[PDB]
Structure formats: structure tokens, C-alpha cells
Design a protein around this ligand. Structure first.
Ligand SMILES: [K+]
Ligand SMILES: [Mg+2]
Ligand SMILES: [Mg+2]
Ligand SMILES: [Mg+2]
Ligand SMILES: [Mg+2]
Lengths: 247, 260, 290, 218, 51
RNA sequence: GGUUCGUUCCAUGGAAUUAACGUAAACCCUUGCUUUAUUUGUAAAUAUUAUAAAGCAGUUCACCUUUAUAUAGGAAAUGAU
């Protein structure tokens, strides 16, 4: 029942004094397999199925060590080299060793919902600029634009805003082929005009999705996120500071 | 250094009973192979080939002209011993599988018998007559006969030195002369430029020399004599040799795919 | 189309060709004549020799010392002469010290000692790993982290250990001892490049541990306990020396295991583990009374 | 002192004393290290003791206050003088590659210079001539020049046949349908083309550079 | 390991990622499994039942 | 010695190996998208503003360039987004 009369402590792994014991043990195993199966034929690089191997951080975490990047770079070469062996000729051992280096990560998928088209033929686009949120209903009209019930000249007194409001139709030269009925809320004069731009753009794409490359270059697809900065305590404004008296 | 090794079944001390007396085999192999090896050693005494086998030297030292003289000794020593490793103290019965396949490629065992023998005398020069097993990606295994002048390697990796045709009498002004001439230049031009005339599978597996026949003068000039009067001679040497072919071992190297 | 299909047929023909190519390589090769192969590059690993003769040491460039200028006058006791501008280490001096060190490795392995083979150079990884396998020792082929012997408590804190017995098999019942026990230290270090890593050899002399090293012409011979005057810059001599020492350990381990099967242990319990036994009886004594 | 106090030669002494008695006075000393008994009967060798090195040449008998008494001497053999003479008479004999990588070191066991230049294991080179020369000079009591002439002449005849075989080998090989690869002459010329063309580009550029650099002088 | 970061990967064992259409009229309508029409059986395949 | 927005990262040193704080990360507001909720908000409506709970998202991919081959960077209204 008592302990054995003779006993002595012995390290489990032979690489007991190395920097990363667990890593080198797995690395030497590969090198041991790259000496008896190195005569097997290989497959051309371009004919090797793409494998998403693990990264340096992944190995560091799963092993609990601080393996050096350089040492791992040369250890990954063995994997790629041992992966070029012919599948039919590849042994079962290497196969089992080549599944522990694969990276089973899947990025999140966020597919936006496409804009439908009503039964009567109106697509509803949404644009925003600095306070506002427009809702443009684009149909196969003849160029009559109504902003919040009023016309383009009765709502916008600045011709600069009228042009930017329907820029999507102007850049693509379709002013005389669509009727737009928008409803805007919040914001100022230009803020609402810019909102209408992105709105008609999205709505126009629903009818003709092939115009995005052109609208991209016309500046009717980016949502300008610039927003009024807040007032900060100690400052007269967002940045302006009071007079600093040196004396 | 390359050193002489014993023969298959103690032919050096006894020799084949009805083919070559012990004295003849002594002068043919022990007193000749030693001479060739002695020369070969001096050539590769201080090169990478100091520890390479004969075949490796043959294939490696083939295309390079500067080492042509090394190919001869190395290839000759290989072919010479390759010719003795297929005889037998007693005639062996041809294997069934081999017997069948032979008839499918040559029509009969005697048809091939008179072809190799006939090819020998037709050459009127020292050379080696082989029995090669041809194989291509989809084509079935097919046998054929090849003649190598002086020292000629039957393997496909030594195509440069195959030496299958004497350019002296095979290139004239006749229709065949021009045809042979074009091939002669086509091979030289291709080889020189590095182009490949006939695609070959990797590893040189298309051709596998199974059997060989040494027609050099030293082998038979003693036992069978000059051949004046048709009694004996080079002709009889080839005939008697056909009775000691170790068909069993021949079948093994053939490695015919099971198709019966 | 046809260009891609060709690759397919080839890839599907490699298995068959390889088999046939291997078979044909058997009979055809060796036919012409017997080669007298008397040197293979990887011969010091597949089958290292038990003892190294003068020829082996001279053939492995174990006598090419460093330049005359870059020498250490201290180790002028092994230099034979001066040729080609370098110091020629005496071949006999190398063999004598090598056999002596080989005897040290054997006994230390025969007494259950923990050996460590240290070679830290680009091409010394296979040499050290092989020697360790034979001697059942530990290898080290990277930069020795300073303070792994004098500060082992921190560096080698998480690495696991075990407890073995006469026949080197685990002993269940030392679970509580493998958590308060402090890390191990090598009972013998076999360095293959003392000039490079002097921080390891200093911790050995600072912790009272014997060492073996390959002293070159410019290496201080006072760093190691047992010197092996030879050429350390040669990957062919390092493989020979390491091979000889590896066989020494192997031969030593063999004797130990042979003496353990006869009920003759060639080593007594270490002091550390010995203390645990005393504590075990103390704790067990309480159960008897209580 | 940039060095450190090494005590690798006293590990046994220091360790043996530390294991003599226990730190807790009044108890049996614990078991010593496992290695203490292994190297018990193997004391280290003596180091750092400058001896009189081996004298490979007679030391200057005239020197009254000689220096460098503890300095290893140069190794000079009688062959050194002969090697220098021969290789100076045949400088292009050094272009013949010679392997100095020993296989097993047992190459001087089958060398009998009484037979001739050709030997087992070593190639025909200047060394064989020197060793043969030295043999005749010593055994046959010949003079340096006489022995040099004889052995040297045998060297020529052996080299002549070697060069004749190459020409006759390739020539005879083509008589039976033997084709070879690119000779060294052709290959050498090809590489010069690739290098010469690169020089043309550089020249053209720098030439144009100077022209543009000449417009600024005016 | 305590200081090691985590990679962002879709956890397909989440109840939200397992069934993307939570309507019972689609999960129990012989979508993939057979003869598991009972609602209780479905719950047992998602939660640990003590009874 | 290089690199990085950064003692970031790689390599290396005949002495390093580590911990806490700060840094970083994360958080709040904000931006696009997905799902949920439709009153006191929304003209209509099969739901698209608004309201607000949770989740995803970037320098990610593409292109170009790149040291000691170990660590990477550039381009900015006419690549994607
Ligand atoms: K403001
Ligand atoms: Mg050195
Ligand atoms: Mg540091
Ligand atoms: Mg309401
Ligand atoms: Mg919303």
C-alpha cells in the first residue's frame, strides 16, 4: 500500500528545457514524417486544394505557448509540403496530422434585403443627412417631382439644392423617365436635399440595378456620416475654448 | 571503388556445361570485367561517380559528350553481367504466361528465336541484343527486340547512346538512305536543342530490358572458334545460348499484367 | 479542355508508375558491379559508431582549428602545429578526451541521471534529437533561455513531471508531490558549441552540475568540466562526437535496466523525493493513532 | 575583469562536501545527487598549463634570448617544397578540380609508390607526381631534378591518353547513331549573350544620361 | 490562454442560428426529421429536461 | 537593426523570465444592414419615416509593392463596399 521504495522524478516530454515544449514535440513529429515518407511523389502547387491553415495566434492559444513566428513559418512549410503528397498515396497518419492545422472559422453573413417594387410600380428608397430621413417613391413617370406636396421650385429656393436633390436622375440622364414623390422631415435646406439624393438613388437601383457603377462615380451612394459635434464642458463650442490667460 | 563480384551459380569455377567451358567463362567475365572495372575506377576515382552504381553512371553519364568514354566502360560492365544473370545450369521450361504473351507479339517462340539470332549475325559487329518490354499509358504490354551497337543502353533514360543503327551503311543516297539520314539529324538536332522527340513516362518504365545477348568477339571467339566451315562460330554461339535462357527469371522481370 | 484533361490522366497514373518504377529499380540496380560505399553523408545518424578512431576524427575535420590569430593561448595544450594558417588540433588528444567523456555519459546514465544534449546552431537539430533518443535524454536546439537553472521555479513552472521506478514506469500515488516539487535540473549537460552559449555553462558551474563541451581553438577550456578538443564549426564532426556520446548513454541505460530486472537498483531515491516519504509516514502515523 | 569566476572543474569537490553532512545538525545526510557517484573515479583533466609545444623544425641554435617558446610551430614536410615547384611549372593543373573531402580517412593504406603514378583511391594529380618523385629521390637515390623528370614524364603520357579518349569516344559514338547534348563551348557562348545584352542596356542608359547631363553645361 | 483572444465564428448551436424560421408551422412540418411532429419532443432536443 | 497610429510586431543581446496599473481592448453616442415591436408616432400600404431592444460590419476582399524572407505597406471622386 505504501509508496515504492525506489522512485525518481523524470520529465514527461524530452523537450523539457526548450522554450515551447509542447510545440517542438509536434514539430519534431512532422520532421519525423518528412523523413520516411519524403520519397512519395507530390502534386503540382496549382493542383492542391486550398486549405485555410491555422494562424500563429490560434496555435499559440491551443498550445498555451509563445511559439515564435519564424519557427512556425518553417513548421507550416512542412504542412504544405506534406499536403502535396498524392491523396491515394498519402498515408492515414499524415491525414490525421493534417486535420489539426485546419482553421474552422466562418465569418458572419449579413445580406441586406433588396428593395421590392409595389404592384403599381413605386420603389421606396431611404436617405438621411445630418437630421433627416427621406422616402422617395420612384415610378415610370415623365419627370414631375413633388417634394412634400410642393414642387421643386416652391420647396427649394436655391437652385443648387434642386440639382442635388434629383442628381441621380441627372447623372444617369433619366430626368424625363421617372416621377418622384418624396417626403422629407427634419434638417435644413441642404440637409434635406442631400437626403433626397441617396433616397432616389436606392429607389432608382431597384428598377435598374445596373446603374450602381455609374451612381458610385456620381456621388449618390455614399451616406455622409458627418454630424454636428456636441458641446463639451469647458469649451465655448465643440472645439472653441475660452481665452486662455497666461498671466 | 568498383570491385568484381561472383557470378550467379558458380559459373566462374565450373561454367555452363554445354554452353561455355569454365576457361571460356573465366576469360569472358573474370578476366574482362576486371579489366573494364580497373579502367572505370581510374576514371571515377575522384569524381561524384566514385560511389555510384554502374546503372546510375550509365544514365547520368549519357548526354554529356565530355564523359562519353566513361559511359562505355560503365555500360559495358553492366550489360556484360546483365547477360550472365539470365543463364541457368540446366535449361528451364518457359513459363505459361510468358509463353502465351510471346506468341501474341512474335507469333511463336521459334519466330522470335530466329529473329534475335538472325539480328546478331546481320549486325556483323560487337553489340548486345536485348528483349525489351514496351508499355504506354493506354497501350497493352507489348514485347519487341532491340539491337545495341558496341555499348548501348536499352533504357529510355539513355536514349542518347542507344546506338541502334550503324550510320556507315545505313545512310546512303537510296530512298532508305535519305530516310535514315533525316532521322539521324532529327535526333541530333532535337537532343542538342533539348527537344524531346518521343514522349516517355517518368521513371523510365516504358522499356524494361528482360533478356540480353552478348555478341562481342571475346565471348565466343574461343569456345566456338572462327566459324570457318559453319561448324561452330558466332552462329552456333547464339544457338546454344538459346537453350540456357532462364525463362523463369525472364518471366519475373517481365512483370506481365494478369490478363489470362 | 484537352490541356486540363492531360493533367488528370497523369495524376491518376502516378500510383501505378511509382509501383512499377520501384519494382524495376530492384533487379536492375546492383547488377553491373559491387560498389565499395565507404562514406554516406547521413551515416552518423542512421548508425553512429560506438568509438571514434583517428581516421573517423580526421575524416570529419575534427582537427581544423581556427585561424592562428583568433586563438586562445590557454588551450595550447591540444594544438599539434600550424598549417594553412590555422591551428591543427592533435587527433590523439581528441580521441583521448572523447573516450573519457563517453565514459562519463555512460556512468551518469547508468546511475539514473538526467542528461541534456545542447546543440544550438542552424544544422545541429537532427544531431541532438537523435543523440537524445539513444540516451533517453533531453534535447535543446534553440537559444537557451537565461535563467532556466538558477530561476527554474518561474521558467519551468508549468511543465509536467512524473515519477518512475526501477524499470522506468509510472508510480501512482505521487499526485500531491508533483505540485509542491520544484522543477528539475540536468544532471549532465553535453554542449556542442560552448563558445556560443556561455550563459548555460555558467549556470551549470554555478549550480554544481558537470558539463561536457567541444572546445575549439578559440574557446576557453575552463567553461566545461570535461573538454573535447575538436572542431565545433563542422557539422560532420559534431554528428560523430554526439553519436559516440549517444551510444554511451544507450549502453549505460541498457545496463541499468538489465540490473533492475535482477532486483539490483543502481541508484537510491533522490533527496527531494526522499523527504516526501518521511512526510508520508508522518501523515500516515496520524491515521494509525487517530 | 569582464570574465566570470567559472568553477566547472570543482563541481565534484563542492558538491561532495555539500552532501557530506546535513544542514539540520543531528540527522543523517540525505542522498546525494545521482551524478555524484558516476564521475567519482573520473577526475577532470588539467587545463591552462602552457607546455613546450612540439618542435616541427630545428629551433634556432644561435638565439640567446628566444621568444615565443610556448607557440605552436609550423608543420613543414619535404613535399611542400616539391609541390610548390611542380604546381608552379603547371599552373593550369589547379583548374582540375580536386576533392579534399575524406570519405573514411583510410586512403593512405593502399598507396604504394613503387608501382607507379596510378594508385587506388586517389586521382592522377600533381600530388601523385610529388609522392612518386619523393620515392625515387629517397629509395633509388636519385637527385631532385632526375626524380622530377622521370615521374613527371609518366604523368604526361597518362594525361595524353585521357584527352585522346574523349575525342575518339564522341567521334566513334556518332558512327553508330549517337547524339549528345550541348557542348561546353556552345553553352559558354550562350551565357555571354545574356550578359552582353545586359551590358548594352546599361551602356545605352548611361550614354543617354551623359547627353542629358551635357545640356546643363551650356 | 487567459490572455489569448477569441476568433469570431458563427456558432451554429445557438437557438437563433439553428432555426432561422422560428415559426412552429415550419419546424414541425416534417422539415428534415420524421415523426417528431410533437412539440414537446422538439423542445427536448433543445433544452435539458429534468422530468 | 527594422517595423507600427502605439514598448505594436519580428529578429537579436556573454541574462533574462514575469505580474499589476496606464496603454490597448471594451463601453456610451453616432453610421449601414438584419430581426423584433406599431401607440400617444407614420398620407397610403403587403411597411419604407419615426421610436428602441438585441445582433452583424472594415481595411474585410481586390489591386500594387515588399527587408534578413522573420514582422508588412501603399493607393483615396472613376476596384467592390
Ligand atoms: K453649432
Ligand atoms: Mg568554432
Ligand atoms: Mg527582451
Ligand atoms: Mg394610434
Ligand atoms: Mg430604423
Amino acid at each position: 500500500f505504501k509508496l515504492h521504495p525506489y522512485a525518481r522524478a523524470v520529465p514527461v516530454s524530452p523537450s523539457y528545457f526548450t522554450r515551447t515544449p509542447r510545440f517542438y514535440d509536434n514539430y519534431l513529429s512532422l520532421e519525423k514524417l518528412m523523413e520516411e515518407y519524403e520519397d512519395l511523389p507530390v502534386i503540382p502547387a496549382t493542383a492542391v486544394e486550398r486549405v485555410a491553415w491555422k494562424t500563429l495566434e490560434d496555435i499559440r492559444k491551443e498550445l498555451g505557448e509563445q511559439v515564435k513566428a519564424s519557427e512556425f513559418a518553417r513548421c507550416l512549410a512542412l504542412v504544405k509540403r506534406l499536403n502535396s503528397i498524392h491523396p491515394d498515396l498519402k498515408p492515414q497518419e499524415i491525414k490525421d496530422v493534417l486535420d489539426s492545422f485546419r482553421r474552422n472559422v466562418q465569418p458572419f453573413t449579413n445580406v441586406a434585403k433588396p428593395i421590392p417594387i409595389d404592384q403599381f410600380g413605386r420603389a421606396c428608397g431611404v436617405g438621411k443627412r445630418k437630421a433627416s430621413s427621406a422616402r422617395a417613391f420612384v415610378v415610370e413617370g415623365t419627370g414631375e417631382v413633388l417634394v412634400n406636396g410642393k414642387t421643386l421650385a416652391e420647396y427649394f429656393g436655391r437652385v443648387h439644392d434642386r440639382e442635388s436633390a434629383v442628381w441621380a436622375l441627372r447623372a444617369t440622364n433619366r430626368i424625363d423617365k421617372y416621377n418622384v414623390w418624396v417626403k422629407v422631415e427634419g434638417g435644413g435646406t441642404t440637409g434635406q436635399a442631400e437626403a433626397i439624393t441617396l433616397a432616389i438613388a436606392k429607389a432608382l437601383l431597384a428598377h435598374e440595378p445596373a446603374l450602381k457603377p455609374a451612381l458610385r462615380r456620381a456621388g449618390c451612394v455614399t451616406r455622409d456620416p458627418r454630424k454636428v459635434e456636441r458641446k463639451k464642458h469647458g469649451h465655448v463650442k465643440a472645439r472653441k475654448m475660452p481665452t486662455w490667460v497666461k498671466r | 571503388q568498383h570491385y568484381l563480384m561472383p557470378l550467379r551459380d558458380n559459373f566462374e569455377q565450373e561454367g555452363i556445361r554445354n554452353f561455355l567451358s569454365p576457361g571460356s567463362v573465366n576469360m569472358a567475365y573474370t578476366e574482362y570485367q576486371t579489366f573494364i572495372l580497373e579502367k572505370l575506377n581510374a576514371l571515377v576515382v575522384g569524381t561524384d561517380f566514385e560511389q555510384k552504381d554502374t546503372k546510375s553512371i550509365v544514365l547520368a553519364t549519357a548526354r554529356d559528350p565530355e564523359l562519353a568514354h566513361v559511359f562505355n566502360h560503365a555500360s559495358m560492365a553492366h550489360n556484360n553481367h546483365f547477360f550472365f544473370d539470365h543463364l541457368s545450369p540446366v535449361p528451364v521450361k518457359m513459363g505459361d504466361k510468358l509463353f502465351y504473351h510471346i506468341n501474341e507479339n512474335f507469333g511463336s517462340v521459334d519466330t522470335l528465336r530466329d529473329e534475335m539470332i538472325g539480328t546478331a549475325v546481320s549486325m556483323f559487329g560487337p553489340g548486345f541484343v536485348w528483349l525489351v518490354r514496351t508499355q504506354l499509358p493506354g497501350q497493352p504490354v507489348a514485347l519487341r527486340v532491340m539491337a545495341t551497337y558496341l555499348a548501348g543502353s536499352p533504357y529510355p533514360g539513355a536514349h542518347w547512346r542507344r546506338q541502334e543503327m550503324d550510320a556507315q551503311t545505313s545512310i546512303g543516297s537510296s530512298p532508305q538512305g535519305l530516310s535514315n539520314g533525316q532521322r539521324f539529324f532529327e535526333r541530333s538536332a532535337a537532343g542538342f536543342k533539348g527537344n524531346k522527340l518521343e514522349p516517355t513516362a517518368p521513371g523510365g518504365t516504358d522499356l524494361i530490358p528482360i533478356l540480353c545477348l552478348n555478341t562481342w568477339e571475346y565471348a565466343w571467339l574461343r569456345e566456338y572458334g572462327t566459324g570457318v566451315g559453319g561448324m561452330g562460330g558466332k552462329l552456333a554461339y547464339a544457338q546454344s545460348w538459346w537453350n540456357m535462357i532462364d525463362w523463369a527469371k525472364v518471366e519475373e522481370e517481365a512483370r506481365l499484367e494478369t490478363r489470362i | 479542355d484537352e490541356e486540363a484533361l492531360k493533367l488528370k490522366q497523369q495524376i491518376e497514373a502516378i500510383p501505378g508508375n511509382f509501383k512499377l518504377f520501384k519494382q524495376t529499380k530492384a533487379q536492375t540496380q546492383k547488377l553491373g558491379a559491387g560498389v565499395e560505399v565507404r562514406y554516406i553523408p547521413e551515416q552518423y545518424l542512421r548508425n553512429p559508431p560506438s568509438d571514434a578512431s583517428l581516421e573517423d576524427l580526421m575524416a570529419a575535420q575534427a582537427h581544423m582549428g581556427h585561424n592562428t590569430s583568433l586563438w586562445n593561448p590557454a588551450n595550447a595544450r591540444y594544438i599539434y602545429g600550424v598549417r594553412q594558417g590555422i591551428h591543427i588540433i592533435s587527433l590523439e588528444t581528441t580521441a583521448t578526451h572523447l573516450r573519457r567523456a563517453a565514459r562519463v555519459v555512460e556512468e551518469v546514465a547508468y546511475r539514473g541521471g538526467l542528461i541534456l544534449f545542447v546543440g544550438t546552431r542552424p544544422g545541429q537539430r537532427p544531431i541532438v534529437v537523435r543523440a537524445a533518443e539513444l540516451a533517453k535524454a533531453c534535447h535543446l536546439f534553440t537559444k537557451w533561455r537565461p535563467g532556466t537553472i538558477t530561476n527554474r521555479e518561474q521558467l519551468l513552472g508549468g511543465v509536467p513531471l512524473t515519477v518512475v521506478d526501477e524499470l522506468d514506469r509510472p508510480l501512482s500515488g505521487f499526485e500531491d508531490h508533483l505540485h509542491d516539487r520544484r522543477p528539475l535540473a540536468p544532471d549532465l549537460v553535453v554542449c556542442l558549441n560552448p563558445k556560443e552559449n556561455m550563459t548555460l555553462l555558467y549556470e551549470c558551474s554555478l549550480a554544481k552540475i558537470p558539463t561536457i563541451g567541444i572546445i575549439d581553438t578559440n574557446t576557453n577550456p575552463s567553461w566545461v568540466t570535461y573538454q573535447i578538443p575538436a572542431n565545433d564549426d563542422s557539422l560532420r564532426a559534431t554528428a560523430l562526437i554526439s553519436g559516440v556520446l549517444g551510444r554511451a548513454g544507450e549502453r549505460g541505460q541498457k545496463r541499468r535496466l538489465e540490473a533492475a530486472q535482477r532486483g539490483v537498483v543502481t541508484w537510491k531515491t533522490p533527496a527531494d523525493v526522499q523527504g516526501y516519504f518521511e512526510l508520508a509516514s508522518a501523515r500516515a502515523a496520524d491515521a494509525r493513532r487517530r | 575583469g569582464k570574465g566570470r569566476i567559472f568553477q566547472a572543474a570543482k563541481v565534484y569537490q563542492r558538491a561532495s562536501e555539500a552532501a557530506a553532512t546535513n544542514i539540520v545538525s543531528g540527522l543523517p545526510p540525505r542522498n546525494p545527487p545521482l551524478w555524484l557517484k558516476a564521475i567519482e573515479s573520473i577526475p577532470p583533466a588539467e587545463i591552462n598549463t602552457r607546455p613546450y609545444p612540439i618542435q616541427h623544425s630545428p629551433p634556432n641554435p644561435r638565439a640567446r634570448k628566444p621568444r615565443n617558446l610556448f607557440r605552436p610551430t609550423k608543420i613543414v614536410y619535404p613535399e611542400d617544397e616539391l609541390r610548390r615547384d611542380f604546381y608552379r611549372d603547371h599552373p593550369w593543373e589547379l583548374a582540375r578540380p580536386r576533392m579534399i573531402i575524406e570519405l573514411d580517412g583510410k586512403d593512405a593504406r593502399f598507396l604504394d609508390w613503387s608501382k607507379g603514378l596510378r594508385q587506388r583511391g586517389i586521382p592522377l594529380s600533381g600530388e601523385s607526381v610529388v609522392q612518386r618523385q619523393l620515392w625515387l629521390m629517397e629509395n633509388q637515390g636519385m637527385t631532385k631534378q632526375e626524380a622530377y623528370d622521370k615521374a613527371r614524364h609518366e604523368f604526361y603520357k597518362l594525361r595524353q591518353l585521357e584527352q585522346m579518349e574523349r575525342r575518339i569516344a564522341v567521334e566513334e559514338a556518332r558512327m553508330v547513331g549517337g547524339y549528345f547534348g550541348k557542348d561546353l563551348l556552345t553553352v559558354g557562348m550562350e551565357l555571354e549573350n545574356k550578359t552582353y545584352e545586359s551590358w548594352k542596356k546599361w551602356a545605352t542608359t548611361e550614354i543617354a544620361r551623359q547627353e542629358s547631363a551635357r545640356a546643363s553645361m551650356y | 490562454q487567459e490572455k489569448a483572444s477569441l476568433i469570431k465564428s458563427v456558432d451554429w448551436n445557438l437557438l437563433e442560428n439553428k432555426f432561422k424560421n422560428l415559426n412552429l408551422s415550419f419546424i414541425l412540418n416534417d422539415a428534415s426529421y420524421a415523426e417528431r411532429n410533437n412539440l414537446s419532443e422538439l423542445l427536448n432536443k433543445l433544452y435539458y429536461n429534468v422530468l
